[PDB]
């Protein structure tokens, strides 16, 4: 019912992030950010809880040389909650999902940001820890 608030975005196109699931992929090469219109010379960038297109540069052979939708769950750029706390994680990590939203994998390693959790309910179910 409530769309996500604007948060700082620190993952432009061309960033490789950890893949925190059991799909076998170990990398996620951000390809483009869904819902981004952009302007001249402006790289599309993604933050926590944003669906992106990604390719696997290191992992199971059948997951490579292909384009997968993915969702970013942890970022290292500090972002400001509306309650006034600046939060940033240890690493940039995401999971592989399809267009509908449910994960391709089954479990998530490490914490999951609250912004991702309340926006993608299916990921929150598998999230071991929150925020």
């Amino acid at each position: 019912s409530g769309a996500k608030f604007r948060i700082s975005l620190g993952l432009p196109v061309g960033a490789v992030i950890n893949c925190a699931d059991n799909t076998g992929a170990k990398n996620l090469y951000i390809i483009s950010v869904k819902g981004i219109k952009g302007r001249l010379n402006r790289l599309p960038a993604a933050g926590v809880g944003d669906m992106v297109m990604a390719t696997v540069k290191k992992g199971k052979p059948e997951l490579r040389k292909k384009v997968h939708p993915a969702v970013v769950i942890r970022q290292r750029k500090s972002y400001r909650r509306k309650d006034g706390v600046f939060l940033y994680f240890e690493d940039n990590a995401g999971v592989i999902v399809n267009n509908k939203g449910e994960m391709k994998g089954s479990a998530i390693t490490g914490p999951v940001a609250k912004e991702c959790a309340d926006l993608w309910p299916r990921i929150a179910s598998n999230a071991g820890s929150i925020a």
């Binding site: 942890r74 500090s78 309650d83 006034g84 706390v85 600046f86 939060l87 940033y88 994680f89 240890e90 690493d91 490490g110 914490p111 820890s129 925020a131």
Partner: protein, 63 residues
Amino acid sequence: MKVELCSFSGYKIYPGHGRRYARTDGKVFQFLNAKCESAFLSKRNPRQINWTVLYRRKHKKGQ
């Protein structure tokens, strides 16, 4: 509000200030400012930093 303590310095965190930090294995930590944050990231032990509440408590200073 939830007035709360700094992970490294042990001071009092007020709602507008400070910075939150989340490690890959959970264990959410909280820092008063970049001073304490950089000390914690460089893995300085608070017991040997003089201006820390942990150091003062361990050396029984004050009271």
